[PDB]
Amino acid sequence: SAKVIQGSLDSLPQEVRKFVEGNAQLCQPEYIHICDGSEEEYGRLLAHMQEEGVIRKLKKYDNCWLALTDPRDVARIESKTVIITQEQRDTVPIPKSGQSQLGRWMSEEDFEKAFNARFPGCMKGRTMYVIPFSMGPLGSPLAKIGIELTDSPYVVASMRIMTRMGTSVLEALGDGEFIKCLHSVGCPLPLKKPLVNNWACNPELTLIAHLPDRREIISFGSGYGGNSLLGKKCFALRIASRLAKEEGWLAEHMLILGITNPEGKKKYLAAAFPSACGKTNLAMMNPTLPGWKVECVGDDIAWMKFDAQGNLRAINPENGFFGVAPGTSVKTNPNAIKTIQKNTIFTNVAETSDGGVYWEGIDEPLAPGVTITSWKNKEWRPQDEEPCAHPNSRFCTPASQCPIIDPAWESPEGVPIEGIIFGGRRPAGVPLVYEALSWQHGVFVGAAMRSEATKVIMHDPFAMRPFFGYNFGKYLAHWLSMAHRPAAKLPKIFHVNWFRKDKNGKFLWPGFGENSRVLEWMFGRIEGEDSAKLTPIGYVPKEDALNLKGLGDVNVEELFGISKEFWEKEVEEIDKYLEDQVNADLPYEIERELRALKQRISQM
């Protein structure tokens, strides 16, 4: 109580009080700031970080900010990310011959050692911020509350954008369940190691842990993104996927968009692509086809549940976009360009001398006079060796500012999903687009997903490889079980490939807003249109079914080319992968789909 500098311990729901005070006794913060989520709290905290050189203000824009990190702490790190369960098998399938790549289990005993070696006294001299936050619209029956303790002001500010945060959240929680989220940069005062670029972090000791059985996320040593903004990956994919398994719903690495045709008919679609494969870009697409409209519900994470009527309802549980900045240009994503010019926090991009932002791929000239400070706080010119922005640099921006944010983006009941799309980067062999033969086939298609690393072609089932909160075999069984709900309206499932390249490494499909031509065919297919031709991998568009006018040289034969040699190779790789990685936990229906694809290919 003596150390509370905002709010009141007496005021917290009892269980929230125990969490705060228990971890205060452990971490030894100098003060405790219970966040209220107010504009005043936000602005004062921003100005404070500014005074201290933790952030700089971008004067070219309205209320925007730039943080530059320790180059040791620049990304979410999978090698340091663990899930603790009594049994390894509940976390990952026990692989047949190899090491698992579907999760990273740590015993409770090992974790307890790691914890006791990190957290005691870790917030000495620092403020513990208490962040009460809702993943999902505040009223929604699909929403879940978390409380994050952190000693990073950069985390509080970013969480205000990426979640719904504040007092109204505590008042909505009452004596209900919440996910316990503990974070420390791991740099108690006085500092024992030198502070780099005013960015507190402890790389040697970084550890991002999930303890689903205790409803706890415990993360240490990193101030960055997914390691520190605990609502996003840790809560909304890892903890949630398991919660969803227990509760009958789904927590997925999916964008949600609403699409409207020239008649005004509207549908919602969800899509799972791995990072750097274009979700944010699709979710706020500027469609090239006249009359068509795409509206954004979320760009990263979907929580979905069948309602009493059998509609699959999806909410975006985030309150903002945490997008990769480099590659973002008016040509590629004009709506992201529009959103990020106010109330936005940037991380590890270059700064122009007039107080604007810059990054590789921004594809927009600088005025004669304007110079560039790189993300490493050094002067920079287009012919230095280093990129001006870090490749994983970011904007953190309010969802409500996207000029095409969907009008139901915050509806507490969610939006009805009629189609689910899978995809990644495949330079060869995979057509632009196909549609699954059935639900069980579609689940197989999700399971089989592969994507060029950003020359290796990696497996990334459902775009969830880094995020499974529990056994992936069980997660497949959970997806298959959806067909066994009597009322369920199972959405059509599609697979796309924006990235097939021709013989000289050039893209066959222009992509971007031209992807609206692919969405149109999907939409028509959901309505039951006779626009599909059967192939060994599923339905592809008929000849002339796609609107290809205005395109120029589009080699359709090569684009939808299905080679026997490639697909024989593809099934072997899928076969081996599923055998090793899922092994005893592979559902029968999946093996059956694998057998069936092998057989259809063998008849070519």
Ligand SMILES: Nc1nc2c(ncn2[C@@H]2O[C@H](COP(=O)(O)OP(=O)(O)O)[C@@H](O)[C@H]2O)c(=O)[nH]1
């Ligand atoms: N060639 C091509 N590139 C794309 C397309 N969509 C997105 N990209 C690029 O893919 C990279 C990642 O895009 P992004 O929206 O950040 O993907 P996310 O990480 O999944 O949200 C960016 O450089 C984009 O310019 C597309 O349709 N075609």
Ligand SMILES: [Mn+2]
């Ligand atoms: Mn994205």
Ligand SMILES: [Mn+2]
């Ligand atoms: Mn993501």
Ligand code: NA
């Ligand atoms: Na800094």
